[PDB]
Every structure is written in C-alpha cells, then in structure tokens.
Design a protein around this ligand. Structure first.
Ligand code: ATP
Ligand code: MG
Lengths: 339, 18
C-alpha cells in the first residue's frame, strides 16, 4: 500500500499549489445572513452565518483591519489566511470563502457545531485517559501533517479545538501558524502552553508544538494545566524550572509520555528526535490507538455533542452582539493587498 | 488539592494570547 512518506509527499504537492497561488475574494458580505456570535477574540468575532443561496450554515471570522495593524499582527494575519486556504486534513477546519471590505477581513469556515473542547473539558472536569487519548491522536496526526509542510502551529489549546458532529476534533485559529524551514523567534502563544525555549528568547522550531501537545494532554487528563498561576511571570518560572507534578490518577504510561513531551531540553523532547513523530505514535500510552482508523474517522467517539437542528448554537456561550459597520473609506488597503 | 487551587485561580476561563 501507499507509504506514509508517499502520502505526505502528495499532501505537500497539493498544499504547495495553493500556497503559491492563494485564493482571494471568493464571496462578499451580502451573500450571508449573520445570525449569532459564536466566539470573540482580540481583533473581532466569529459569527454563525447562513449562506443565502444554499442555506448552508458557516462560521464567519471577522477581523478589524485597523486593530490588526495597531496590535502589529499584519504578517501573522496574512500567514493565517494564506495557510488556512492551503491546508487539507480531516482534523483541520475547512475554509470555504474569504474576502475583505473597507473595514474588515473575513474568513468563512465550515461551522463546527459541537463547541470548544474548552467548554466540555471545564464542565466535565477532566477526560478519562481513553477520551484524552482519542483527541490527542488527532492532534498528533495533524501536527505530523502540518510539520511535513514546514508549518508550525503555535497556538494549541482547548479554546482553539472544536468538536464536530461526529465527536472528532477540528483545529481552528491559524493566527500564529507560520511556514518556516529554519528556526523562528516570535514571542507568541498562550502562557500555559509556551515551551521553555520560547520564554527564554531562543530560536525555536516545531518542537514547541510537541511541548504544547504535552500541556494539552496533561490538561485534558488532569482538568488543569501542568503550570498555572495567577501571574503569567509565575507561569513562566514554573515552565523553565523543569519540574512537573502529576495527579495520582495518571497512569504510568501517561506520565512517561508527558515527561518526554514536557522535556525542557528540546534536543531530548519526543517529536524532535531522529524518529520524529514516530517516537510519539509508538509510545506505550498510544499502544491501543489505531492510527489509520483515527485518520479514517472510523473510531467511535467518546461522546457526540447534542444537536437540536441546523444552526443550533447551544454548545457555545452567548456573547454581546455588535452590528458590523463598514466604513465608506478603505482602511489599511496596502497592508492587506494579498488577503 | 491542586484542582481546588486551579478552580480558585484567575486562569480557568478562556485564555488570551501573548
Ligand atoms: N469554524 C468554526 N465553527 C464554530 N466556531 C468557531 C469556528 N472558528 C472559530 N469558532 C469560535 O470562535 C472563537 C474564536 O475563533 P479563533 O480562535 O479563530 O479567533 P481568535 O482567537 O480571535 O484568533 C473560537 O474559539 C470558537 O469558539
Ligand atoms: Mg483562538
């Protein structure tokens, strides 16, 4: 059968064609009815919308161009759109349209209706190890895919992981994703998830994604992250210390995996050794994982989100709504020419 | 317990980036 190497080479050829010739301007605002805000962020909001012609529901991410410029996130936002329109993997959210107007940037994605992993995790407290493992396996495959394309993701957390109608993961928010063949230096990410080499202002590489997977698995299985404190500086001190405490309920296999992902020396960290991702896939904690079956989405999920029809948003918190205003003057046109 | 210390902390809601 096809080898993993051949699979990934075909994925790269597919990605590169879209990476070098990105799609642009494939819809406009009055193609959609805006329904409800699904989530918010630094530069705008994500809204449930209905496409008028098809009746399909989508999730429309709206970014205020002037705010992006002010917070010095122009290149990151160009990264986000250029990468998201070029990737294709079962656990990555599908971009359907993108466009811009005088005031805003718009990325219209497939609507993932089961809510954030964050919401479910906080509510239930913690996931069982089989439950955490099912989600972790999807992240492992997704990072295998992204890294083979020279992409670093850099914003793994339950707030950016959505549950679909099958109970599988959809990764969203490519705001810090970047295509890089060497090391990179940007201080970005979420405090609890930062690898030590980010904090220490070293160059860093895709090994920070495997560190963040360690944080995610720990948080999923424990119900709290391995390093937390009210002040981020105190979080950073714990991260660089090289000390992790584990709940007594963690299996010995889980602790061993986590010691190797939450390894402060990036040169000894799993995912960053000679065998790459296979040191993670072959680890005892994943011994029951059928990696091909996960990729094919044939495994029964630990739970299916409740759904009461199309356009149901009950798996999402409510947010204060704010009407879109589009200025009569084009803002920051040159900065976002390639969007 | 560590769980109680987390739930009493200021970091249990949605977390912003740096
Ligand atoms: N495709 C989607 N389907 C459903 N909800 C989404 C989708 N994309 C984003 N969301 C919701 O919107 C929130 C913010 O989106 P995102 O993380 O992309 O924006 P950011 O953090 O502001 O950058 C998410 O945490 C999630 O709650
Ligand atoms: Mg986000």
């Amino acid at each position: 059968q096809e080898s993993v190497k051949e699979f990934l080479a075909k994925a790269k050829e597919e990605f590169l064609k879209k990476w070098e010739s990105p799609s642009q301007n494939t819809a406009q605002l009055d193609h959609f009815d805006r329904i409800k805000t699904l989530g918010t962020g630094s530069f705008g909001r994500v809204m449930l919308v209905k496409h008028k012609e098809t009746g399909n529901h989508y999730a429309m991410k709206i970014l205020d161009k002037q705010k992006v410029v002010k917070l010095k996130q122009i290149e990151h936002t160009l990264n986000e759109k250029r990468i998201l329109q070029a990737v294709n993997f079962p656990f990555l959210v599908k971009l359907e349209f993108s466009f811009k107007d005088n005031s805003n940037l718009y990325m219209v994605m497939e609507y993932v209706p089961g809510g954030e992993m964050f919401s479910h995790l906080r509510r239930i407290g913690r996931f069982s190890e089989p439950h955490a493992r099912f989600y972790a396996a999807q992240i492992v495959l997704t990072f295998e895919y992204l890294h083979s394309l020279d992409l670093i993701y850099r914003d793994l957390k339950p707030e950016n992981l959505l549950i679909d109608q099958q109970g599988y993961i959809q990764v969203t928010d490519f705001g810090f994703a970047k295509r890089v063949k060497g090391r990179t230096w940007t201080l970005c990410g979420t405090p609890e998830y930062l690898a030590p080499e980010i904090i220490l202002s070293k160059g860093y590489n895709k090994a920070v994604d495997w560190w963040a997977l360690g944080v995610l698995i720990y948080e999923m299985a424990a119900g709290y992250p391995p390093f937390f404190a009210d002040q981020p500086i105190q979080i950073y001190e714990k991260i660089v210390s090289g000390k992790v405490r584990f709940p007594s309920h963690f299996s010995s296999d889980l602790k061993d995996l986590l010691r190797n992902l939450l390894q402060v020396d990036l040169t000894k960290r799993f995912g960053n050794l000679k065998n790459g991702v296979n040191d993670i896939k072959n680890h005892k904690w994943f011994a029951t994982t059928d990696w091909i079956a996960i990729y094919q989405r044939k495994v029964e999920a630990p739970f299916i989100p409740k759904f009461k029809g199309p356009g149901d948003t009950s798996n999402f918190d409510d947010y204060e709504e704010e009407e879109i205003r589009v200025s009569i003057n084009e803002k920051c046109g040159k900065e976002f020419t390639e969007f | 317990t560590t769980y109680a210390d987390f739930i009493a902390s200021g970091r249990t809601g949605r977390r912003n980036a740096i």
